[PDB]
Design a binder for these strands. Sequence first.
RNA 1: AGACAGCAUAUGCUGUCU
RNA 2: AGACAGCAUAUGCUGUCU
Lengths: 132, 122, 122, 122
Amino acid sequence: HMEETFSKPNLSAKDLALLLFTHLPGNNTPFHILAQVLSKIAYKSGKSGAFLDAFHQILSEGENAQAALTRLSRTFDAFMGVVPPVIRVKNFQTVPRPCQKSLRAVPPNPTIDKGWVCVYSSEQGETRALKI
Amino acid sequence: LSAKDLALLLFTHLPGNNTPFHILAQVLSKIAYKSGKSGAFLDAFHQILSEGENAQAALTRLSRTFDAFMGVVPPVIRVKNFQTVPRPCQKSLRAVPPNPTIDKGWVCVYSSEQGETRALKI
Amino acid sequence: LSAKDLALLLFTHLPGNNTPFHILAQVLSKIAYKSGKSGAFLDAFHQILSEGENAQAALTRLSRTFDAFMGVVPPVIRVKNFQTVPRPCQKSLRAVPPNPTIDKGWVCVYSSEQGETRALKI
Amino acid sequence: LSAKDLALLLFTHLPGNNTPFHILAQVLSKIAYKSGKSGAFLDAFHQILSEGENAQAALTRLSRTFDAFMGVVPPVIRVKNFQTVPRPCQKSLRAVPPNPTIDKGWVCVYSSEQGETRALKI
RNA sequence: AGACAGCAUAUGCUGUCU
RNA sequence: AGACAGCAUAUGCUGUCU
Ligand SMILES: [Cl-]
Ligand SMILES: [Cl-]
Ligand SMILES: [Cl-]
Ligand SMILES: [Cl-]
Ligand SMILES: [Mg+2]
Ligand SMILES: [Mg+2]
Ligand SMILES: [Mg+2]
Ligand SMILES: [Mg+2]
Ligand SMILES: [Mg+2]
Ligand SMILES: [Mg+2]
Ligand SMILES: [Mg+2]
Ligand SMILES: [Mg+2]
Ligand SMILES: [Mg+2]
Ligand SMILES: [Mg+2]
Ligand SMILES: [Mg+2]
């Protein structure tokens, strides 16, 4: 039982994002998208455990999960310089409703560490970036 | 004045029923009573109403500035499951963070019969 | 590119509608275009975005550093009364100082039917 | 110009309401008035604005440099308690230092009904 | 839906201290 | 550069009333 008590495996990107979702208010907000985006980059970087630990450390300072994710996007080394992923959509009406008003023209050189979550591209080759 | 008598006075100033603010008023009233600052708490609450702000603003202000409350951890409240949490409180439940305090808006920690927990956040 | 088309492009980078930054975009687009410096203004804007600053920061920076704006008096715009100013701008209205300029964050001077003036500040 | 009218004039240049700068504007207007220097005070304020400085910077500068304010003790303002202090000033209350003076950025000393003091600092 | 209220985040501008 | 503060905008969450 002691092995079972103390064993803490690294989480998959999907399990990581699900844990984050439990601390966030609402559903399909820009923070939910960021949680999925960051979880994927953290995982592929081999930093799933470090990222989750850093997330909890910020929370333990009294900050909520929204403040934690934006701080991590700013400071966590696996995110520095990283470009937001491009996501194909039929059109921009397809972007989750609570995200739509956070859409902006793509700047020339968008990065996660400046608050750019993802870039949506439509079937017409148009693009918008999701900004927190 | 008792913890329960205090809480009902506050209820007369709050819109609706069993909202997060109702729970907060109950949680604060108990802590205030136990610290012996039950009188001082109510006066502070009235003082703020006089200044033109409402009850919600009074409770959040007091929860952040009232001596008795600063640093205090939200209490654990047993429920059968999270759908027996009062309905106007259910969409304000989150995972419990490591160090919740009432002065940041954490009202209480609900624990289920499975030993799972959620925190009520204003 | 016309002043009008310049402002429409800048609007694609801006959050909200009719904010003080929308007004500033329109005011700077007109001044830039009249200076014959429309191409240079748009290039300097993009160059700033490309350094990682957002569009709001780029417009205030251009207002402070783009030669064609230094010491320029904000344009006077006639309005029925200050309730007619766009809602998101009304809280940013101040008494007109002596010697307002664009480079110090003064966007425009609203002039009411009754002859009073307020200046919009970013 | 009376202390009240002077403060009213200054208020038209300030953002928000009941900020520490509104309290300073009232404090300085009274001191200038009492010393027969309201005219010179208003002129010095306008002069600084006409250099492109904003109203907040003008008031902090005048508090430091205008002769009528040098070494003046901030006025003591009696209040029920510190919840009575305007909300935008509350986070700017500090312990009263040794020898508070207007020219070192201390605006006023609030004295609670229970004999405690805190000073408002810009 | 809207109005109001409370909470949070991001950005800009300003001021003070180190 | 950081800490803190003030003001504004934008967005999101929750509650009530209609
Ligand atoms: Cl219980
Ligand atoms: Cl005063
Ligand atoms: Cl007199
Ligand atoms: Cl007197
Ligand atoms: Mg299609
Ligand atoms: Mg009620
Ligand atoms: Mg919008
Ligand atoms: Mg008006
Ligand atoms: Mg004002
Ligand atoms: Mg929260
Ligand atoms: Mg500074
Ligand atoms: Mg210093
Ligand atoms: Mg020093
Ligand atoms: Mg809402
Ligand atoms: Mg709601």
